[PDB]
Structures are given as structure tokens and as C-alpha cells.
Amino acid sequence: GLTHRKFGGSGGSPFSGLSSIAVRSGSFLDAIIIDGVHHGGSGGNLSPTFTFGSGEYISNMTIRSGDFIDNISFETNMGRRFGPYGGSGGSANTLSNVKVIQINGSAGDFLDSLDIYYEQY
Amino acid sequence: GLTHRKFGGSGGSPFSGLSSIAVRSGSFLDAIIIDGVHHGGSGGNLSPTFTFGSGEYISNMTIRSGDFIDNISFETNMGRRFGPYGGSGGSANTLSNVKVIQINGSAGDFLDSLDIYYEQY
Numbered sequence: 168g169l170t171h172r173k174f175g176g177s178g179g180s181p182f183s184g185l186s187s188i189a190v191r192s193g194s195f196l197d198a199i200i201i202d203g204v205h206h207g208g209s210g211g212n213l214s215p216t217f218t219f220g221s222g223e224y225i226s227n228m229t230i231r232s233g234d235f236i237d238n239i240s241f242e243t244n245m246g247r248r249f250g251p252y253g254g255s256g257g258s259a260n261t262l263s264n265v266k267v268i269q270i271n272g273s274a275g276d277f278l279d280s281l282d283i284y285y286e287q288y
Numbered sequence: 289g290l291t292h293r294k295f296g297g298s299g300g301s302p303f304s305g306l307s308s309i310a311v312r313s314g315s316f317l318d319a320i321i322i323d324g325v326h327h328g329g330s331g332g333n334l335s336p337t338f339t340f341g342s343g344e345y346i347s348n349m350t351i352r353s354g355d356f357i358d359n360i361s362f363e364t365n366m367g368r369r370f371g372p373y374g375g376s377g378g379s380a381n382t383l384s385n386v387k388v389i390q391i392n393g394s395a396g397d398f399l400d401s402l403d404i405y406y407e408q409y
């Protein structure tokens with residue numbers, strides 16, 4: 168039942184509600200920072216903030232996952248990369264040739280889970 | 289081609305990448321504030337910030353739209369309301385019995401357009 172609708176005119180500079188991503192990472196992802204909002208704990212080391220340009224979106228992803236999120240790395244449609252950040256635990260999963268719309272999940276002292284909404288090309 | 293995939297375990301507190309919404313509003317929406325990130329101009333009056341709780345999402349929307357976004361108002365699945373903020377220009381459109389996933393769009397000195405990704409129930 169997923170879809171989208173457009174409202175408004177044709178002007179302005181296109182933006183995404185998913186506008187910037189950073190992480191706190193050690194052996195796991197202690198937190199994911201979405202638009203400067205903290206989602207996780209206080210451990211780990213804070214990575215620099217990746218800010219999407221207008222029309223730039225996540226196109227490729229590799230996630231290492233177990234009971235928590237062990238590692239994350241992604242690439243945008245304009246050739247920019249983020250990570251890999253995290254450890255070697257968990258199991259690997261990938262998203263390829265996509266347009267990531269939204270990054271949700273659950274977090275505590277660590278980043279427990281991620282729910283990525285995306286268009287598959 | 290829209291879908292989603294889950295990674296990780298079952299712990300933690302669920303969050304949304306669309307975690308808070310505020311607006312600058314006059315006769316139009318001068319800006320929409322998503323997770324504290326400014327999308328629009330400096331005119332209008334800054335509304336208070338609406339922060340979603342865990343498991344709370346936008347379920348109903350009314351948007352007044354023309355060349356720009358004239359007005360916005362929404363209600364969550366837990367009975368909370370936001371707005372209406374803005375003017376009486378444009379034409380009215382609605383989203384009903386949905387779960388809003390992501391709010392994108394384009395902005396300049398005003399909020400030009402909105403692209404709402406949502407699940408229709």
C-alpha cells in the first residue's frame with residue numbers, strides 16, 4: 168500500500184526529509200544520527216556528518232546485522248560513499264540499485280534495528 | 289517499486305526518520321522544519337515543534353496547494369493534531385487513513401512543493 172503524492176508548484180530546490188546521516192560506531196552502531204537527531208546510545212566514536220545534495224540519494228547499501236546493527240555503508244547516486252562504520256559481527260545484507268526514501272528503526276544504548284523504505288529499480 | 293526491508297534484532301525503542309515537524313507560516317508556508325532542518329525561507333512565524341512519539345505517525349492530512357504550499361494540517365494515529373498553519377490560498381487536498389513514511393519537497397524563500405510518501409490503509 169506504499170505510494171506517494173505531490174502537492175504544490177514547480178519552483179524551489181528539491182530536498183529530502185532524510186537530509187543528513189552520521190553514526191556513533193565501535194564494534195557496533197551505537198547510534199545513527201538522522202538530521203542531527205540522536206537514535207541510540209552514547210558509546211562509540213562520532214563519524215562526520217554526510218549531507219545529501221539536491222537530487223542525491225542512497226543508491227547502494229551494505230548492512231551487517233544481528234541482534235543489533237553491527238555495520239553500515241552506503242553509496243549515493245552521485246558516486247559518494249559513507250563508511251563502512253562499525254564491526255565485523257552480524258551477517259551481511261545489501262540493497263542495490265535503489266532510491267532510499269526513509270530510514271526508520273529502533274534504538275536503545277545501541278542501534279537495534281533499521282527499517283529502510285526505498286524504491287527498487 | 290516502493291517497498292521496505294528490516295535489519296537487526298527486536299530490541300530498542302522504535303523511531304522514525306521523520307521525528308519532528310515545525311513550520312514558518314504566514315499567508316503561505318514560508319518553510320517546513322523537518323527534524324530541526326530548515327526547508328524554506330525566513331519569513332512567517334515559527335510554529336512550535338511537534339515531536340512524534342514511538343509508534344506515532346501522521347494518519348490524516350489536509351494540504352492547501354498552488355504554486356506553493358499555502359497551508360498544512362495533520363492528525364496522528366494517537367489523536368494529536370498539528371495546525372492548521374498558513375493561509376487560505378491554493379486548493380485543498382487530503383490524505384486519509386494513511387501512515388506517512390517520509391516528507392520530501394522543494395523549497396526556496398517559500399515551501400514550493402511537498403512529496404509525501406505514505407502507506408494507504
Ligand SMILES: OC[C@H]1O[C@H](O)[C@@H](O)[C@@H](O)[C@@H]1O
Nearest residue numbers: 192193194195196197210211
Ligand atoms: O560499538 C560498541 C562499542 O564498541 C567498542 O567497544 C567501543 O568503541 C565502545 O565505545 C562502543 O560502544
Ligand SMILES: OC[C@H]1O[C@H](O)[C@@H](O)[C@@H](O)[C@@H]1O
Nearest residue numbers: 274275276277278279299300
Ligand atoms: O540498544 C541495545 C539495548 O539498549 C538498552 O539496553 C535498551 O534500550 C534495550 O532495549 C536495547 O535493546
Ligand SMILES: OC[C@H]1O[C@H](O)[C@@H](O)[C@@H](O)[C@@H]1O
Nearest residue numbers: 313314315316317318331332
Ligand atoms: O507566508 C508568507 C508571508 O505571509 C505574511 O505576509 C507574513 O507573515 C510574512 O512574513 C510571510 O512571509
Ligand SMILES: OC[C@H]1O[C@H](O)[C@@H](O)[C@@H](O)[C@@H]1O
Nearest residue numbers: 178179395396397398399400
Ligand atoms: O520558494 C519560492 C521561491 O523562492 C525563491 O525566490 C527561489 O528559490 C524560487 O526558486 C522559489 O520558487
